[PDB]
Amino acid sequence: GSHMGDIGQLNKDLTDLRIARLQYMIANGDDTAAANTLAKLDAFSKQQAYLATTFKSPENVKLLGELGDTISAYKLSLNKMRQGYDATRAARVSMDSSAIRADQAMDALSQEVMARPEADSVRLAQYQLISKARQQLLQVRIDVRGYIAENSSANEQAALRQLDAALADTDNLKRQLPSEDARLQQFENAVLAYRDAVRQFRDAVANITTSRAEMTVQGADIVKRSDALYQIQLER
Amino acid sequence: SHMGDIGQLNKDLTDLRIARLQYMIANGDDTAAANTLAKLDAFSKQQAYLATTFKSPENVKLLGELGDTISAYKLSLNKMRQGYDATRAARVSMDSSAIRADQAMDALSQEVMARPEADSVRLAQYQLISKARQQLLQVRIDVRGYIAENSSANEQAALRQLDAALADTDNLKRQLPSEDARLQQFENAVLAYRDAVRQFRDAVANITTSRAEMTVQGADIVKRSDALYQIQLER
Ligand code: NA
Structure with a gap:
C-alpha cells in the first residue's frame, strides 16, 4: 500500500501549496512570502516528478502526466502574479x-x-x-x-x-x-x-486578479486529478 | 465506508483553511466572513456526525479532541471578526x-x-x-x-x-x-x-493574535484528522 502513501504525500503537498499561495497574497505579495510559495510549489512538482518515475500502470502514469501539465500552467500563472506584485x-x-x-x-x-x-x-x-x-x-x-x-x-x-x-x-x-x-x-x-x-x-492589480482566477481553476483541476489517483489506489 | 467519511472530514477541513485565508485577503469583509462561517459549521457538522457513527473508543476520543479544537477555533475566528469590525x-x-x-x-x-x-x-x-x-x-x-x-x-x-x-x-x-x-x-x-x-x-494586533491561534488550532486539527485517517487505513 506504499503507492497509496505516496499519493497521500502528494495531496498534502497540494494543500500546502494552496495555503502558501494565499499567505503570499495576505503578505501583500512580498518577496519573502514569494520565496515560501515557490518552495511549496517545488515540493509539489518534485513529488509529481518522483511518482511519474515510480508508478507503473498506464492510467496512473497518464494522470500524473496530466497533473504535471497543470503544474506547468500553475507555474506560469504564479509567475504572472509575481510580476503583478512587482509592478x-x-x-x-x-x-x-x-x-x-x-x-x-x-x-x-x-x-x-x-x-x-x-x-x-x-x-x-x-x-x-x-x-x-x-x-x-x-x-x-x-x-x-x-x-x-x-x-x-x-x-x-x-x-x-x-x-x-x-x-x-x-x-x-x-x-x-x-x-x-x-x-x-x-x-x-x-x-x-x-x-x-x-x-x-x-x-497590475488587474493582472494579479487574473492570475489568481487562473490558479483557482488549476487548483481545482489538480485536486480533481490527485483525487482520482487516490481513488485508484484505494480500489486496491 | 468510515475511511471515506474521514475523507470528507479532511476535505471540509481544507475548505475551511482555504476560506479563512480568503477572508483575510478580502480585508475581512462581511461577505467573506459569512463564507468562512459556512465552511466552519460544515466541518463542525461532519465532526458531530462522525461522533455518532464511529464506535471504537479510540476513534470516539479522537473525534472528541477534534471537537474541542473546533470550539477553540470558533472563539478565535470570533475574535478575528471582532477585530475587523473594530x-x-x-x-x-x-x-x-x-x-x-x-x-x-x-x-x-x-x-x-x-x-x-x-x-x-x-x-x-x-x-x-x-x-x-x-x-x-x-x-x-x-x-x-x-x-x-x-x-x-x-x-x-x-x-x-x-x-x-x-x-x-x-x-x-x-x-x-x-x-x-x-x-x-x-x-x-x-x-x-x-x-x-x-x-x-x-485591533490589528487582535487580528494578528487570533490568526496565530487559528494557525495552531489548524495544525492540531490536521494532526488529529490524520490520526483518524491512519486508523481506518490500518484497518
Ligand atoms: Na468640541
Missing part, C-alpha cells in the same frame, strides 16, 4: 517620487513668491491659489491610498476622477498665473506622471 | 474626525478674512493656517500608508507625525491667540483622530 510595488515607488517632485515644485514656487517684492494683496492672492493646489493634490493622494488599501472599482474610479479634476484645475492655474508657467509646468508634468503610475498600479 | 469602526472614526478638523480650519481661515487688518498680516496668517492644514493632510497620507501596509515602521512613523501635528497645534494657539476657541475645536478633532488611529492599531 504594484514599482508603481507605488513611482507615485511617491512623482508626488514629492510635485510638492517641491509648488514649495519652490511659494517661496519664490514670498521672496518677490510685489504688492502684498497680489502675493496673498497668489499664495492662496498655490496652497489650494498643493492641498488638492494631497487629497488626491489620500484617495489613491484609500484605493491601494482597498482595490475596489469604486475607489479606483473616485481616485481617477479626482486626479483628472486636479489636472484640469492645474491647466486653469497656468492660465491664471502665466508669469509662473515654467514652475506650474514642473508641477503639472509631475502630476501627469503620477497619473501614469496610478494607471500602472490599476493595470 | 478596524472598520476606527476607519469610520478617522474619516469623520479628519473632516471635522478640516472644517474647523476652514471656519478659522474664513473669519480671518472678515477681520480688518493689514495685508502683510493677512499674508503671514494664511501662511501658518495653510501650513497646519497641509501638515494634517500629510499625516492622513502616512496613516493611510499604514492602513495599506500594517508594519511597525509605518505605525510608528504615523504616530510620531501625528504627535508633531498636535504639538504644532498648541504652538499655533500661541501665534494666533485671538482664535483660541477655534484652534481648540481643531485640536479636539485631531486628538480624537489619534484615539482612532490607536484603536485601529490595537
Whole structure:
C-alpha cells in the first residue's frame, strides 16, 4: 500500500501549496512570502516528478502526466502574479517620487513668491491659489491610498476622477498665473506622471486578479486529478 | 465506508483553511466572513456526525479532541471578526474626525478674512493656517500608508507625525491667540483622530493574535484528522 502513501504525500503537498499561495497574497505579495510559495510549489512538482518515475500502470502514469501539465500552467500563472506584485510595488515607488517632485515644485514656487517684492494683496492672492493646489493634490493622494488599501472599482474610479479634476484645475492655474508657467509646468508634468503610475498600479492589480482566477481553476483541476489517483489506489 | 467519511472530514477541513485565508485577503469583509462561517459549521457538522457513527473508543476520543479544537477555533475566528469590525469602526472614526478638523480650519481661515487688518498680516496668517492644514493632510497620507501596509515602521512613523501635528497645534494657539476657541475645536478633532488611529492599531494586533491561534488550532486539527485517517487505513 506504499503507492497509496505516496499519493497521500502528494495531496498534502497540494494543500500546502494552496495555503502558501494565499499567505503570499495576505503578505501583500512580498518577496519573502514569494520565496515560501515557490518552495511549496517545488515540493509539489518534485513529488509529481518522483511518482511519474515510480508508478507503473498506464492510467496512473497518464494522470500524473496530466497533473504535471497543470503544474506547468500553475507555474506560469504564479509567475504572472509575481510580476503583478512587482509592478504594484514599482508603481507605488513611482507615485511617491512623482508626488514629492510635485510638492517641491509648488514649495519652490511659494517661496519664490514670498521672496518677490510685489504688492502684498497680489502675493496673498497668489499664495492662496498655490496652497489650494498643493492641498488638492494631497487629497488626491489620500484617495489613491484609500484605493491601494482597498482595490475596489469604486475607489479606483473616485481616485481617477479626482486626479483628472486636479489636472484640469492645474491647466486653469497656468492660465491664471502665466508669469509662473515654467514652475506650474514642473508641477503639472509631475502630476501627469503620477497619473501614469496610478494607471500602472490599476493595470497590475488587474493582472494579479487574473492570475489568481487562473490558479483557482488549476487548483481545482489538480485536486480533481490527485483525487482520482487516490481513488485508484484505494480500489486496491 | 468510515475511511471515506474521514475523507470528507479532511476535505471540509481544507475548505475551511482555504476560506479563512480568503477572508483575510478580502480585508475581512462581511461577505467573506459569512463564507468562512459556512465552511466552519460544515466541518463542525461532519465532526458531530462522525461522533455518532464511529464506535471504537479510540476513534470516539479522537473525534472528541477534534471537537474541542473546533470550539477553540470558533472563539478565535470570533475574535478575528471582532477585530475587523473594530478596524472598520476606527476607519469610520478617522474619516469623520479628519473632516471635522478640516472644517474647523476652514471656519478659522474664513473669519480671518472678515477681520480688518493689514495685508502683510493677512499674508503671514494664511501662511501658518495653510501650513497646519497641509501638515494634517500629510499625516492622513502616512496613516493611510499604514492602513495599506500594517508594519511597525509605518505605525510608528504615523504616530510620531501625528504627535508633531498636535504639538504644532498648541504652538499655533500661541501665534494666533485671538482664535483660541477655534484652534481648540481643531485640536479636539485631531486628538480624537489619534484615539482612532490607536484603536485601529490595537485591533490589528487582535487580528494578528487570533490568526496565530487559528494557525495552531489548524495544525492540531490536521494532526488529529490524520490520526483518524491512519486508523481506518490500518484497518
Ligand atoms: Na468640541
